[PDB]
């Protein structure tokens, strides 16, 4: 006869996304309720046991199971703890927590990436034959001022109660290798306003202005200017890298910077080719590629 | 009579040098052995007391003196602890530690600076009339792949047991002011490979290339190019500063950057002087005099 | 008497936070240790679970729980939930979650194409192999199917060893040590496309100085080129990990400096060493300079 545990998680804040570590900080409360043997509470009213006093009750025989956050990176910061002991036997454990959680996160679509913040809960020592999760309730807020927030929570929390089967387990008692696991998922979308106006938009103007090399009259002017253009992209790649999050792969912005290098480099080849490959004689159509070069770039841009 | 304490320190790692704080991280073990009153150990075999249980023995009367790292910056991170109690009375305290230590460090010769990592041990409450250090043994591991390490441990650890006569000793009165101190010194030399090839070498090419301004024909070309040169040194001073450690003084690389500024600025004055005082034959052809003059001043920077 | 046989099982959940300069890395996982001690009279002769705070209370009352130290851990690790499963026959199963910063000799000279092995060294803190011995070790790494998005690619199931460490400066000098090795390869995608590829274009574009007509144009452009390499050397240094040696990218940057500097000296040599008469071969080194660079590049 497994002990049924009702869980309720209150999410107060989701912040501190670490791109490289694939982590995110979560502040909130955790409430767990189960029914035990009836007790003789003072005045037959629910008894409150806070923090340090909890340990004293455990030493005296009170059963308080350890519920572990499967995906937490290191011991979470547990604030105030509380046990509400009812005379009928039901026990309510309430505690504040702040933890750094892990999940597989893909930032390839940055700054237009969509992530899901997950919380995985499971008893640390009791299998589903001893302790089971009966239900889960997740309570997020309703962010009305999303514009100020870095992340936009879209839709209420998702929940999943399942059974995790470990193949390499200690005991061999047939069918006692399964643990009840709560899984919470909160979908969110990055606020791309800042990256669109301060990174994408200026980069577009830099790349577009780089096409103006073809409007210059002299070959010496066309070639020398392209080096100032090349230096502008390097100056921008640096401005980008110093602010953008570190990742083991390229993002949308990174690819634009690579495209910028390609465009300038391709123009350098065209500038030299037009001035040295002729009968004597700058090619008419290739130097007047002032319209063909941007369209060729936009075509490759759309394919990407 | 003074309790003789035999100490053994095992250094596992020396890293995390903080230039501005003059601090460095040291991971290792500390072993202290002394002889007390004989004990009745279970089955007359040495008794092992680990971590939490050590405090229980102290509460019951076991004398475990506190040994302080004089030069540690804040309480060190103590790992596993143990007490080995022998029936004959000898006690062996062993503990893992990671602490941030301080020492006077001079980085003026960077990236060719040589430092010595020091550990200073001393009893926290007992003078040399109560507790004395009999001997010290320091064990440093070999740098198997020295080419990979940031620091190269040169000298096998130096050790010395001295007696520090503390001045302001509250209520000690006759002679409770001489304390036995263990001092460990580990000499090390910085690996300059990276700084030579990625900082010194390119800087040399930048400064040398700046001298080619005298090979330009027109005054307008000589002066305008020198501004691109000036901007190159600024860009390089920035590339240097962002990577090099922060210090309250200039290093070898910093002086080279200053010399770069001076060379370009001096050339700007020469370029203007030649053109406004028909270009001077010798001044415009200082293509050989300017580099040699710089190299001559460069030799004084070393000596 | 005989040594207490301890069966260990390590579960690796995450390997991250590689510190290049410190040669350290963070490891999150579980550690399971099983041994047989003196039998107990467990309630109802069924296995007894002892969690966290209660573990220390059992130790105070006589339960023998030996301290197992991570030899190569940098500072005390962060221990999460702890558990003791006490059987009536005498079996003891210790299980704990841990997060620690571990050290190992790491060579990043081949960056961004370097291959490393993350090691874990376990050993009893006070009991030698005559008192406590490791009977077996089993390491469980999780298969990463979404390996494209990870910084490191764990290449191969963990290697395991059980050796005996002899301590000279202390016949009770030998300790049982478990050694775990996890081989990994860096994901070079980002560095290839955003750091190697653009640099290649910058170094190649520097060769177009010879395609300029005037000596004044060839020399002045070379300073804009030299400034471009400095600007790139900076975009690289700010992102790339700090090391006491040069990497592949660093050497490319040095080569860039050399190429531009050599071109400056060739541009001056061609214009001032003659019978204004630019040497026909020297100024037409538009093909000789890139091939000469590629030849040195192969070395």
């Amino acid at each position, epitope marked *: 006869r497994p002990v049924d545990v009702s869980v309720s998680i209150f999410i107060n804040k989701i912040y501190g996304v670490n791109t490289l570590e694939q982590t995110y900080k979560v502040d909130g409360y955790i409430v767990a309720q189960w029914t035990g043997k009836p007790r003789k509470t003072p005045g037959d009213k629910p008894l409150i046991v806070e923090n340090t006093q909890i340990e004293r009750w455990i*030493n*005296n*025989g009170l059963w308080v199971p350890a519920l572990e956050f499967i995906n937490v990176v290191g011991s979470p910061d547990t604030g105030n703890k509380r046990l509400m002991l009812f005379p009928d036997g039901r026990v309510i454990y309430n505690a504040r927590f702040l933890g750094s959680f892990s999940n597989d996160m893909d930032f390839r679509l940055f700054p237009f990436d969509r992530q899901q913040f997950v919380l995985e809960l499971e008893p640390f020592s009791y299998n589903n034959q001893q302790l089971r999760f009966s239900d889960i309730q997740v309570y997020t807020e309703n962010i009305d001022n999303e514009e100020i927030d870095e992340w936009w929570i879209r839709g209420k929390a998702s929940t999943h109660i399942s059974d995790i089967r470990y193949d390499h387990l200690s005991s061999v008692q047939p069918n006692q290798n399964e643990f009840s696991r709560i899984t919470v998922r909160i979908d969110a979308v990055r606020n791309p306003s800042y990256y669109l106006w301060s990174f994408i938009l200026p980069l577009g103007l830099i790349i577009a202005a780089s096409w103006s090399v073809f409007w210059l009259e002299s070959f010496s002017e066309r070639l020398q200017t392209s080096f100032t253009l090349m230096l502008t992209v390097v100056a921008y790649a640096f401005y980008t890298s110093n602010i953008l999050p570190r990742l083991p792969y390229t993002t949308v912005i990174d690819q634009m910077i690579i495209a910028g290098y390609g465009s300038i480099f391709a123009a350098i080849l065209l500038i030299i080719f037009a001035h040295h490959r002729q009968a004597n004689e700058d090619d008419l159509l290739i130097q007047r590629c002032r319209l063909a070069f941007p369209l060729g770039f936009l075509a490759i841009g759309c394919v990407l | 009579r003074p309790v003789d304490v035999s100490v053994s320190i095992f250094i596992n790692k020396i890293y995390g040098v903080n230039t501005l704080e003059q601090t460095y991280k040291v991971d290792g073990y500390i072993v202290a052995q002394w002889t007390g009153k004989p004990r009745k150990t279970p089955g007359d075999k040495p008794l092992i007391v680990e971590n939490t249980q050590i405090e*229980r023995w102290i*509460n*019951n009367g076991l004398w475990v003196p506190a040994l302080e790292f004089i030069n540690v910056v804040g309480s060190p991170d103590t790992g596993n602890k143990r007490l080995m109690l022998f029936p004959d009375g000898r006690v062996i305290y062993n503990a893992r530690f990671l602490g941030s230590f301080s020492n006077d460090m001079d980085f003026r010769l960077f990236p060719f600076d040589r430092q010595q990592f020091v550990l200073e041990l001393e009893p926290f409450s007992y003078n040399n009339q109560q507790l004395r250090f009999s001997d010290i043994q320091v064990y440093t591991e070999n740098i198997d792949n020295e080419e990979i390490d940031e620091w190269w441990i040169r000298g096998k650890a130096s050790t010395h047991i001295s007696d520090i006569r503390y001045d302001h000793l509250s209520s000690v009165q006759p002679n409770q002011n001489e304390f036995s101190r263990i001092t460990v010194r580990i000499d090390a030399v910085r690996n300059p490979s990276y700084y030579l090839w990625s900082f010194i070498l390119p800087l040399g090419l930048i400064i040398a290339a700046s001298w080619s301004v005298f090979w330009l024909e027109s005054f307008s070309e000589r002066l305008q190019t020198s501004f691109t040169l000036m901007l190159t040194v600024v860009a390089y001073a920035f590339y240097t500063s962002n990577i090099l450690p922060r210090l309250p003084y200039t290093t070898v690389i910093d002086q080279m950057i200053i010399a770069g500024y001076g060379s370009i600025f001096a050339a700007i004055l020469l370029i203007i002087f030649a053109h406004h005082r028909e270009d001077d034959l010798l001044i415009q052809r200082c293509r050989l005099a300017f580099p040699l003059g710089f190299l001559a001043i460069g030799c004084v920077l070393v000596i | 008497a005989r040594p207490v046989d301890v069966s260990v099982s390590i579960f690796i959940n995450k390997i991250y936070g590689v510190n290049t300069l410190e040669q350290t890395y963070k490891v999150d996982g579980y550690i399971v240790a099983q041994w047989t001690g003196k039998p*107990r*009279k*467990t*309630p109802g002769d069924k296995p*007894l679970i002892v969690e966290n705070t209660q573990i220390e*209370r*059992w130790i*105070n*009352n*006589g*339960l023998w729980v030996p301290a197992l130290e991570f030899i190569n851990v940098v500072g005390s690790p962060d221990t999460g939930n702890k558990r003791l499963m*006490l059987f009536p026959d005498g079996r003891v199963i210790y299980n704990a979650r841990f997060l620690g910063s571990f050290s190992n000799d790491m060579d990043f000279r081949l960056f961004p194409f370097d291959r490393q092995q993350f090691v874990l060294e376990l050993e009893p803190f006070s009991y030698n192999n005559q008192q406590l011995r490791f009977s077996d070790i089993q390491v469980y790494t999780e298969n990463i199917d979404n390996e494209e998005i990870d910084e490191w690619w764990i290449r191969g199931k963990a290697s395991t060893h059980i050796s005996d460490i002899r301590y000279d400066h202390l016949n009770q000098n030998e300790f049982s040590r478990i050694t775990v090795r996890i081989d990994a390869v860096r994901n070079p995608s980002y560095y290839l496309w955003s750091f190697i590829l653009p640099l290649g274009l910058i170094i190649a574009a520097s060769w177009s100085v010879f395609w300029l007509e005037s000596f004044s144009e060839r020399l002045q452009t070379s300073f804009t080129l030299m400034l471009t390499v400095v600007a790139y050397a900076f975009y690289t240094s700010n992102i790339l990990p700090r090391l006491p040696y040069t990497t592949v990218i660093d050497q490319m940057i040095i080569a860039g400096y050399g190429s531009i500097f050599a071109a400056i000296l060739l541009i001056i040599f061609a214009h001032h060493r003659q019978a204004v008469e630019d040497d026909l071969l020297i100024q037409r080194c538009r093909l000789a300079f890139p091939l000469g660079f590629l030849a040195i590049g192969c070395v």
Partner: nanobody, 129 residues
């Protein structure tokens, strides 16, 4: 210094009763878990009964349950071990131990003797007929 002065032992006729006393001195009595032990000739010392004040725990050996009652009195800093309906098997040296971190609940499982910092000299209790 810690002194666990025991009294109330000696010779007893089979089936009789005896009340042991352990006068605790040299330590804060209440924050300890005083108890009683016994060691018959050529047999390992066993645990009899242990009473802790901090907890509401009380251990009773199976060989003595139903004929023993342990009690505390902090007013006099003493522990009384009353054994009724004695047997010749009860003959042993009765030691009085006192530990700080000793839990009577855990002791019933471990039967360790490790958390007892201070021990008594022992009082001989002989039962015959």
């Amino acid at each position: 210094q810690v002194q666990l002065q025991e009294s109330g032992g000696g010779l007893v006729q089979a089936g009789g009763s005896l009340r042991l006393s352990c006068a605790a001195s040299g330590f804060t009595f209440d924050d300890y878990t005083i108890g009683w032990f016994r060691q018959a000739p050529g047999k390992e010392r066993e645990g009899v009964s242990l009473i802790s004040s901090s907890l509401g725990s009380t251990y009773y050996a199976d060989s003595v349950k139903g004929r023993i009652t342990i009690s505390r009195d902090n007013a006099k800093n003493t522990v009384y071990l009353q054994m009724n309906s004695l047997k010749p098997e009860d003959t042993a040296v009765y030691y009085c131990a006192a530990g700080r971190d000793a839990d009577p609940t855990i002791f019933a499982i471990l039967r360790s003797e490790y958390p007892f910092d201070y021990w008594g000299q022992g009082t001989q209790v002989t039962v015959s007929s």
